[model samples]
Structures are given as C-alpha cells and as structure tokens.
Target: KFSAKRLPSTRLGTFLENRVNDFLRRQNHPESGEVTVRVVHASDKTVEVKPGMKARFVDSGEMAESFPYRTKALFAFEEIDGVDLCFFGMHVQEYGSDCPPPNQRRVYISYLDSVHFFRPKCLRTAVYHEILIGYLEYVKKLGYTTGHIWACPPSEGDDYIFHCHPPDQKIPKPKRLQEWYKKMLDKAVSERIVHDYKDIFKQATEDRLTSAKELPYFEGDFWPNVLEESIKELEQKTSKNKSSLNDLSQKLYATMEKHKEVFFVIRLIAGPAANSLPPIVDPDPLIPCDLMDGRDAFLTLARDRHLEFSSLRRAQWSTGCMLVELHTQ
Candidate 1:
C-alpha cells in the first residue's frame, strides 16, 4: 500500500501539501485522504491512461483520467472540501509558436473557479488569494517566464456577491467581477509575488479587429465615448496638471484601443446591461470595469517605470474570454 507520508516530495510540494491539509483540517474536513498531492514527470504529448476513476473538467465537459500534456503536478481535493468550491488546474506550454525559439516556459492557469462563500469566516479568509499566491510562488520556482489567466468571471447564477445577506445579495455585475480580479492581481504585484502583469485583453482586442477582420459589435463611437468619459473624470480629479493629463489621456486612448476587443468580449458574455453605466449613486460608477481598471494599472506601472508588456495569445479554448498574463523572472 502507498503511504501518504511517503509520497515523493520537494520543498514546494511539502509546503503546499501541508498548507492544504491544514486548511482542510481547520475547515472541518479532517479526512486523511481528502487532499492528495502528486508529482509526475513532464510530458510533451498527451498520454492515455487505464482509468479506474475519472473527474469531469468543469469548463470543458471532457473526462480527465489523468493530467494533460506538460503537467508538473496535481493537487486533487476531494468533494468533501465543499460543494461550492470548484476545481483548480494548471498546465505548462512552450512559450511561442514560431520556429527557432529561445528557451522559455509558460504556465497556463487552466481553471480557478470559486463560488462566493455564504459563511462570513470564509469570506474573511480570502481563501482563493492565499492558494493563488502559493501557486504563483511555485510557478516562479519552476522558472516559468510567463503566466496566463483567462479572466472570465463565473456566469450569472454561478456567482454570488453579498455573502451573509441573502435577499440583498445578487449575482455580481460584470464590472464588479472584473474589478475583483484586478484587485487580486494588483495585490499580488504589490506583494512582489509576481514581478509584473499585463491585461492581454488589450492586444487581443486590437488583433480581433485588425487580423481577424472582425468588426466590433458595439458602434464605432463606443470607444471614443469611453475615452472622453475617462478624460473628463481624470480632469475632475487632477485638474491642475493639464500637460501631464493630456499625456495621460493619450496613453489612455492607446490602451483603450488595445483592450477594445476584450471589452467587447466582456459585453458579449455579460449581456447588454454591461454596456450601461452604473447609477450615479453607485460607487466609482465606471462603465466597463475592466477597461478602467486596466487603464489605472497601466498608468500606475508606467509612473513607477514598471510598465512591461509581453506577447501572449489566446489558446484555442479561450474563445470569448478575457485574459490577464503575468510575468516572473
């Protein structure tokens, strides 16, 4: 019989396994076999397995008997953790598609789905953030050059916003969901967990229009309107520095154009209501939360001389999804 304590392990392996088991124990899931961590050899091609048991891939309906190609490790948690908790998966891929390439590795975060917790304690703990930071640290140690996340939030009816108050709570608006991701990512960068990050939506947006020969679903004036609104808002906040404001506005326009495609994808998935501005009484009240958040992050990075951009494209399965790519040295 294979003993759990005798499982092959590394520094990160031990750290993550201990952390997960500790979390499981604290959350009342003290079963010894509840969370299993396994390390496997890296593969360049998919492998077939004689299946004794199988798990469903949530995003895709396919059954996964084993990890896909280039899997470094698997952290399989039993259903006892919670029904609302979703699976987290990752894969490593070659950096670029082109011919003679530099030695680089990329880690794709395949899924990181979670439902809001009804329990107040779960919300306070920021469970997802803790796990994610740990995973990023693991990625860094593995010497991956870049990390990618399809920043698509859970569909309506799948996500809840206000946890404790059921009646007042509702499915989170798209902007709010996007904003939440932005906050989490910014926190990661601020903590120096990840060296830098970029919202791939910008480049994807431009590519959709120019290379794909696809016209935006929204009207031509849509981007211009967003740009004008942003400039106006910036003026109100920093009216004294007109020169720098103009420069910032130009940068904002450029960034908006780059991210236009991703915003359209957001609107497409989020429905027409996403196009409308939040009520005046609403906080921040930014229409299209991803764009505003992206703009701010870009500007902040630029001022800090930390702005860095890298080429990242959507995987075949990433259609209709917004993405944020991260870098680590």
Candidate 2:
C-alpha cells in the first residue's frame, strides 16, 4: 500500500474511474444535470475587491466602463477545515465558439486567473449556463481571489477539486465560506447597512440574480427557495405573452435610474459603453444553459474611494464554488 507504484496507480485509477462513471451517468439521462461554479466573496487585500467594482475594469480601459451595473463589494473568508475548498472562476474565459474577440488584449489578468463552473450540453441548459458563467466571470476581478465554485454531476467523480493553480493559491475548507458570509452579515447588521438597507440591497441582489438593479446590498442565501420562486414566476410568464417588449424596456429604464451612481462612479473610475445589452432572463439556470441578457445583477452604492479586501476573498470564492459545483441539488 505504501509502494510508489501503488500511489500512481491508485490516483490514475480513481481519476479514470470517475470519468467513466460520469460518461455513464450522462448516457443514462442524456441531457440532464448541470454544474455551476461561483465565487461568493473576496477578502480586502485582493487585486480589485478593495477598490471593488470601481476598479473592475480600470486596468483594461482608461475610463470606468461598467457603471450602471457593477459588483460593488466582494466576499472574503478564513481557512476552512475540510477539503481544501476554493472557488475557481473562469472569469476571463468564454465558452468555445462564442469566445471573445480574437484581438482582445489582456488589460487585466484577474479574469485569466479565474475559472467558471457549469454543466450539461443541451441548448436550454446551455442558455442559463451562460448567465452564471458570465456573471461570475464578470465579477471575478473585483479584487478578490480569482476563482469560482463549480457543480459537477453528483454521479461524476468527487464534487470538489483537490487542486488547481499555483501551489501558493492556498485556500480554506468550503464550510468557511458560509461561516464567513454569515459573520459578515452579522457585522453589517451591527453597523446598520444590511438591515437598514435590506429592501434596497436585497432587491439589488435579487435583481442581479435576475438582471435587476438598485441600492445598498444584501447577501441572502442564494439557494433552493430563491430558485423555486424564480422558476415559478418564469413559468407563469411563459405563456402570458405579457412579459411584453414595453415591460422589458420599462424595467431597463428603472435599472438605469437605480444604478445611475454606479455608472457615474464607474465612468469616473474603467469606462466602456455597450452597443446593446440583449434582453435576457435574470439569473437563469446555466446547466441546462439560459444566458440571454441581464443574466447578471449590478448594485449601486456611493463610495468616496476604492475598496480593499482580498484575503477573505479566497474563502468566499471557495465556498460558492463548492455549493454550485459539489453539493447535491
């Protein structure tokens, strides 16, 4: 059992067996299941989490590009006890075929350092798949650890990844993310930002999850109930033919109003303009993929200067990565 031959053989066998099992699982269900990865938060010392979203695109463009919608804060965490869990966000990478402009330059390396977690091959699944992928990647460089939480099919290999990146990219166990997020909320409420700003901020989170926008910020459990409610609403609207063009337009205007400060500040800080933001469902499921437009959320806040948090960023990335990727849905 301690022989060198046994070690390599054991690792290879385990890895291959998992892959084979994964293939079989898909064969049985065809296009069922999805894997999603995300980074929930970042510590203050991160590359961009400190200045936060304001600096999200600064190195890339001279002007603060993403105003009307940018992730203002990032999450951070302490070392976890189990599974050297860390979120791996493919922030800078896009899916095949729909890849970025060939000539796009690397103004920022944050994205390249991150990873995106998702799953399945069906177009319906692929659509929502695109949103979560885009959202996490979109926010990867908020000066946090560059990573994402990925969800692998329960039937496939271990849900968690034992390793990735440089050996120096040390991370805590997955549990730390949840513990840290909750602790952050407690601290925020103590200061009155969370509770007082619940309506505005929580809605902002929901909006981002749904492509909506507003003020402050709320860090709620992005889990089952949220998905259930959203799915129900989407189903109800499917046949109504009343989620009209006008309604979408109105929603756009409202978001623009809510995030005006975001735009101004961002513009003042990595500025860019868009030809158009395709109208897509907000926070659509990625597994079975659903990114069209507004798939990501943008919250607004007035800050006098940049944010500073990245170490904790490591833990946040790890946990979200685990939930979306490893835990059973």
Candidate 3:
C-alpha cells in the first residue's frame, strides 16, 4: 500500500516516487516498483546528513551554509569549463586542525563573476599580481618584514596563499605573474635622483626668512592670508608649467603637495627673513614690542620646516615651496 504507485500523486511526489522506483528497478528486479529515497541537510557545521539522504541548509542561506571561512573576504577558483571565476566576499579563517594556524590566515572570494574576471586574461593576471603586491605593502606598513608567498591553488583559492608561519620552500622561487611587480615596488620606495635636495630646501627657508624682513608689506597677523594667496599663485604655476616638469621636477611636485600647507608657511616666514638676513633691529614706536614677535616667528618657522622635511633627508625646498626629498641605496 505504501509502494511508489500508491504514494502521493502530486508532481513533486510523483517525481520523487519515480526517482526511487527507477533506482529500485535498476538495483534488483528490472520491473520493481518500490524504490528507496532520503533527505539531507547541506551545512556541515550546524547540520548533518546521513548516507542515502538529500541535504538542505536549515539556517543562514546558500552561501554561509555552502562554504564558510574566516580571515580574507573572497578568493579564486576554476570550473569544469576552465573559466576562472573569483568569488568576492569577506573571507574568514577558523582555527584548529581544520583551520589555518595562528600565524596563517585564509580568504575565499564569495562572488563568482567579478568585474576583474571579465577583463582580458593577461590583465586579470596583472590585477591579481597588483592585489598581492598591495598586500605586501600593507605587511610592510604593519612592520612585518618577512613572510612566505605561495602561488595559490584553486581549493585554497586566494586564502592561505600569503602565510606568515615559519618558512617552507616547497613552492619554487620567483612566484607567479608579471615581473613588473617588484620593479614598480622598488620604484615606489627608492629615490632615483642623483643628488639629495637638503641644501636646496635649507636655502629656500633662509631665503623666505630674509624676504619677510626686507618687505614693508610683511605683517605677522596678515601673513597667513598672503601665504594662502601665494599658494594659489604657486599652484597655478605648477599646473601651467606641468608640461615642462622633468622626472626630478615631477618628484618634487609630488613631495611638495604632501606638505603644501606647512611649506607655504615656511615660504612666507623664510622668504622675508632671508631678504632681511642682517636682522631688522629698528623698533616701531607703535609696535616696538611686536617686533620681537616677528623675529620669534622666523626662529620657530625655521625649526618647524626642518623637522617636517627631515624625513626626506635630501630634497629640494624652494621659495615657491617646490619641495623634494631624496633617498640613497
């Protein structure tokens, strides 16, 4: 009475009954009508499935129950069609025998058809290379000098690829992707200039200082507005003369932009001071006490400029605040 033929007659029930009957027909008697069927839950962490049963996730959704991770958000993989699809999401890594070690982290991309995947194959490879390179830069920022970089596999996806555990050399040297990775990285941190610009910056500061002293228009209270106007003027010059900037000039422009606010202050105080290097000792009857304030501004300005630019070691600092710091091998 409970045979496939006598079970529920709805489409789903028929489908299920047919599936079981078909299996039973094959397993023993070719004409058999009774077949076996089972149901199962897909999730491993929160659910379990027994043999001969179909599985379904009771909680969360398709993704969380399908594949769970800790650490990185997303990762990569290849399909039966050989098309590489990268999943995008926040990746996670759990600890213990199944999880990565304390020093090792993991990631899996959740989305399959990312914009990065749509790019040409070579560009996609480059993008991957760039992503890993950015990670390397972050590690350096975090004060980590050493780690292992492994060419990743599909199941491992993008996770566990950059491990910080004790080094193992099973993976070969040079890693994967374009050689330009290291080259660009080197260019970013190294100074390619022949000379350091330290003296130039010093001269620029001194010149600004002298300028303040000789110019009758220079007033401590009003200098802030004047310096802002000067910055606008200098910025226009840099933009207009952009085509004329050589490699050195371009580097200087970039460095100056970072400290443009401070550089403008330095220029305002330094230019007049440099012009009045002999020290204008004359005291105005109305503002005799304020004269000392002017000198103090210069002295403090001098010290602050140097401290700010000290990181550059060797770079040009000029009146227009076109500054560049240089480094050596």
Candidate 4:
C-alpha cells in the first residue's frame, strides 16, 4: 500500500493523505509500504521526506510585473529506503491583466519547468504518479477553473535543467516532447483529474475565426503589390503621387492593426524585419545563423494564419514551457 500527506498545512496534508490512500486502494497494490508526501515552504528546510517526497513551495519574493500572483514548487521523490529517485519543479501564476477577463479571473497557468531522474527506470515506481495526482488535486482545490501548461523542451545551461533523459543522452526534440505531454494528458484523463484537454493552437484558431475573411488581404502578391506601388510612386517624384502613397500607408496600417497578434508573433520568431522581408526574394540564401536571419524562413510561408497564433503559443511555451491545459472536474 502507498500513502501521502502535505506538511505544515494540516488541512492540505490530511486531504492529500486521504486522496493518495484512496488512489492506491483503487490501484489494488498489495505491497506494504508507506510513501508519505509533504507540502512545505521552501525556506522550511528543517522538514524532510525520509521515505517519500516533499512538494516544497516557494514564493518569488518580488512579484513579476506580468505574473504578479505566482508560486513555484519543487517535488523531490525518494525511494522507500531513502534513495533519491527524481526531482520535478513547476510554478503556477495568474494570467496577466491583458488576458480575457474570464480567463484572468478563473484560470491559473502552470509551467513544468524542470524534471530530473536520478537513475534510469525510476518511472517504473508509483511514487512520481502519486505525487502528480496529489499535486493536481491540490490545484483543483485552489478554485482554478482551468490549468494551462506549455510543453516546450528545455535548453542547455539554464537554471532549470531538464534531465529526464540520462546526462549522457541527447535531449529529445519538440515533437517528442509534445507526444509525451499528450500521453500525460491521457493518463490524467484516465485518473479522472483532468476533464478534457485541447491544444492551445486549436483554441487560438477558434479565436481567430472572426478575422478569416480578411486573410486573403495579407496573403501572397497583395503585400508585394502595395510595396511595389509605394516604391514606384516615390521614385516618380510627382506631387500627385503623394496622396496615393498616403492612402496605401493607411491601408497597410489598418491591416497591421487588425492582425496585431499575428504580426507580434512573427516579429518574435523572425525578428523585426519579419514584417518587411517576407515579400522580397533574396538570391543569397546564406546568412549567419547567429545573426537571427532566416530564422523565420519556415514561418514566412504563412500557409496557415493559425501558424501565427501557434507561434505565439510556442513562444510562451519556450519561455515558461509545457503545452497542455488541465480542465479539472
């Protein structure tokens, strides 16, 4: 059998203890052992999880301007005999003021920032799963309507290193990470903690339906035509061309304003010139990778407008990372 609990917060501790015990009872595991869990303030290092794990929550001390209400936590999982097995870190925050009122009011966003397994095959044990279940239950208890995560891969040399794979192994790619997130979601659904899951890319697409009619105005030939006309009029040096130039400028500005979110994402991935350079064809395809040139080559195709929205989603994933939403029942 397995058991869990939270520390210091008596109510939270007892709640998790009962929850974990019930979960194990459902699993029908007959092995006899106690896997206690505790939730404690990060500064309270005096408490330890001898035969289990601790979900140590940390306050940011100074609130970030965008996510003023945020808390970070680390989960250190151990074996029944006190050997360290894995460590996971995550943070939860309120969405910024600019978010939709409903989401800002009801949703709490979380990021799976770091994950490390001290030994190979540590996942075979039930400790990590129980910890995650307990944590999700805790999040739901906090009164959040939904929990969001972005599933981005970690980079090397960051403060939160992702060592799910062995140190000798190369980190997996983005697609693999996405697959892992999907699997985790499926498991959560099986556990009945998560009601359902949907990719933010799809959500953003739905949000963009209102502007679908104007999509063609920003497609191929249209932008280039306007730029060509503007340049031609400028070269003519005729006073009559001034009004035409102004009209074109206003049209361009309106289009940009309508799709500001798309353009903002483009700027982030392709850099500042993302706005002006996509329409032009350059013979020299070679640019220094370090110079941030050609980085948006794939995005510049603009095959799907949703790509813009997804790019923004991916940007957020990369910064904070994790790509799933857990809508708790």
Candidate with better lDDT, 1 vs 2: 1
Residue-by-residue lDDT tens digits, candidate 2, 1-329? 11111111222123323333354365564433322223322221112211222332234453222222112111111122322222233222211111122111111112212222212223322233233223333322222111112211112221122222333333435445334333433443453322221222333344463322122111121222233343344446755356666343244445445433222111000212122223222231222211111113210010111111133344334344433432332
Which candidate achieves the best lDDT against the true structure? 1
Candidate 2: residue 175 lDDT (0-100)? 49
Candidate 1 residues 1-329, lDDT tens each?
A: 12223334555545565656576567672332343333322334332322111111212433332222243423322232232111222323322221111112345543332222213334323445546556666655444444555455544342221111223324456567667656666666776766655454453444343311121111112333454455455556643445764444354546655554234221111224323423212111112222112124323433354322111111111111111211110
CA RMSD of each candidate after superposition: 21.7, 21.6, 33.8, 20.5
Q: Which ten residues in a row have the lowest lDDT in candidate 2?
A: 298-307
Candidates in order, TM-scores: namely: 0.38, 0.19, 0.19, 0.44
Q: Which candidate leads in TM-score? A: 4
Better of 1 and 4 by TM-score: 4
lDDT of each: 0.36, 0.26, 0.25, 0.35
Q: Against the true structure, candidate 2 has what lDDT?
A: 0.26
After aligning candidate 4 to the native by TM-score, how far in Å is the CA of 229 from where it should be?
27
Q: Which stretches of candidate 1 lie over 4 Å from their true place?
A: 1-12, 18-42, 46-69, 76-103, 115-125, 155-173, 201-329
Instruction: For model 1, state the Cα shift of residue 274 in Å.
Output: 39
lDDT per residue (tens digit) for residues 1-329 in model 4: 12122222334445554665565566664442333333321210111111110111113222111212323233333233332222343433432223332233222323343233322333323544555556555654443434554455556553332222234434558777666655655666676666665553343344462321212111121333444454455456656435654444444455545433222110011224222322211121221221111113222322232222122233222212111110110
Clashes of each: 3, 74, 51, 11
lDDT of 3 by residue, 1-329 (tens): 11212211232223333433343344453222232111100111211211111121113221122212122222222121232222111122211123212111212121111222212333333333333334333332322222221122222222122111112212223333113333433432342211111222243344353221111111111322443444444556544444764332333344434433322110111223223333212111111112112123322443455422211111112111211110100
Clashes of 3: 51
